[PDB]
Amino acid sequence: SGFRKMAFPSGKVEGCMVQVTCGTTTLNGLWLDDVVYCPRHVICTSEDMLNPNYEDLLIRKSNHNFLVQAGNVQLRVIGHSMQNCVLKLKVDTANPKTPKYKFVRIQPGQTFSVLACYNGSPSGVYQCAMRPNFTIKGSFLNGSCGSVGFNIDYDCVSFCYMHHMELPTGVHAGTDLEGNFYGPFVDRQTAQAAGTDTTITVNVLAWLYAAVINGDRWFLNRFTTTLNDFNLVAMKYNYEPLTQDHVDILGPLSAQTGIAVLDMCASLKELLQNGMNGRTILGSALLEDEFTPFDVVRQCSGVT
Amino acid sequence: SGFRKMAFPSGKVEGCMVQVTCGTTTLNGLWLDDVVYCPRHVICTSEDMLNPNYEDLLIRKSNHNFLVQAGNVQLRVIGHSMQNCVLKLKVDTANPKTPKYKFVRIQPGQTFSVLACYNGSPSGVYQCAMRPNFTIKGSFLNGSCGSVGFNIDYDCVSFCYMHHMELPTGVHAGTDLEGNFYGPFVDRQTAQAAGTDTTITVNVLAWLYAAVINGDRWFLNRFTTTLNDFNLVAMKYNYEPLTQDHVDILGPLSAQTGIAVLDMCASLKELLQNGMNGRTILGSALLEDEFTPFDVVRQCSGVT
């Protein structure tokens, strides 16, 4: 029993982290096979970052300008290319610790683990969610760029995020591993404001199911609702609309607990309208939205 | 910027996890050098667990009754001994992935990472604290016993916890790596009730400092207090007494922020007396106590 905000074990990703230096900028890269992936802004001076022309800055860079260090050993760069907002540095050595892997682009509401790194060395691992406004709420200091977000399926690491920047509001923006930003963000030091940070409703419902499975049940009420009625309440409270696809994904948790999805929606509706009245659910005084239905099943069933 | 509940990177510990089976009981062991450490209740039938005599049960066990599997490869057991509530299985092979390590016994209020494992395979990593009642609030299903808690200092893993049992209240109890339980708990299926789960005051103050460093400052007030006055409030709210040792440990955070420790105590006093009034601090609607002063400095400074 118990329910914790749990990250994937980080060892497979730890084995992939390297330091990339270009001139005076050092950040992190991801070494998979004979390619090192890193944010393209590694080529920028803090001056360049106000309005960088990346193609023009890169003309001034040779293979030997990218210094790649894996532990205390230098890798030989034998090619480089820019794919969207990432650089791919071809090295002469395949990473011997390369796990089975994929590159995936996640949808808002999806959770993943971040291995926060500095100078190619891991500092910590935490769980977070792609917010509906395509930001994440991370913990990143200068030097953390190129840190990655991932999910694991048994022995296959799916990489979904590489860290690139902090908005003036202290929320985080980044790319998939093909270098495409999540949301409308660009790798430039400009005014970039995030949109509404709505609550990920299907994840709150998943976590309420986790609560019931773990014996936190005070919030279960006598009511039900409809998807349309619930959705009127969701819109009022800046919650994401609930779809039938979300209802279907919650089916296994509904089945385990015997609480119909729409009844749990009616419990959620009362919590929104009434507040928690100083009570907690799974040690939280707010409704947690960074567990997916898949996360709750995985944790509640003990998948390795 | 940002502040996350962050676990240590788990790779060094992942390399140490093995499956231990005795008869029909499978749980996790920790393989360091040529010794595998696991809970002694691996020798018990669910029947034995009501009133086990471990010395008598162990007489019936030979080296060949302990099946130790590291990945898909069997280890040869060449000796076994019982140290308090752990078994030490001597194997014929030193773990080649043995990190630099220590065994430490932590104090209540200290935080550590747990690598939750099943059948010797890692499922997840999370951060938690030794509660003042010597329980922890984990996420452990059947088969998770022998999962370990640890801290890392650069390249040295300090192991502080091995998981042994769940109390009837769904909180967790375990040992240090010499097999001594934290608190008064025993490895028997009996009535064992936990004492008061007080709040770890020095950790709340550390997290309020983290909040100020990260720009969450609404709760800063115009007041100060004394250690005696604060402590009268702490006792009323089931907070641990604050000592001058705690004040001294908060000194670096006081210095960074320019907020005297006793002024932050006065802010905490007002939050206790007034509540949060529907506001949040670092995305929490309650006062978080599972970050130590050392954790806040580590995260806020980017140690690897």
Ligand SMILES: c1ccc(SCCN2CCOCC2)cc1
């Ligand atoms: C993010 C990162 C990688 C992928 S793999 C599919 C992408 N393709 C395949 C390779 O050419 C470019 C487009 C998906 C999402």
Ligand SMILES: c1ccc(SCCN2CCOCC2)cc1
């Ligand atoms: C917990 C686990 C191990 C230690 S090392 C010091 C313990 N000693 C040394 C070995 O003999 C038994 C006593 C400390 C706390």
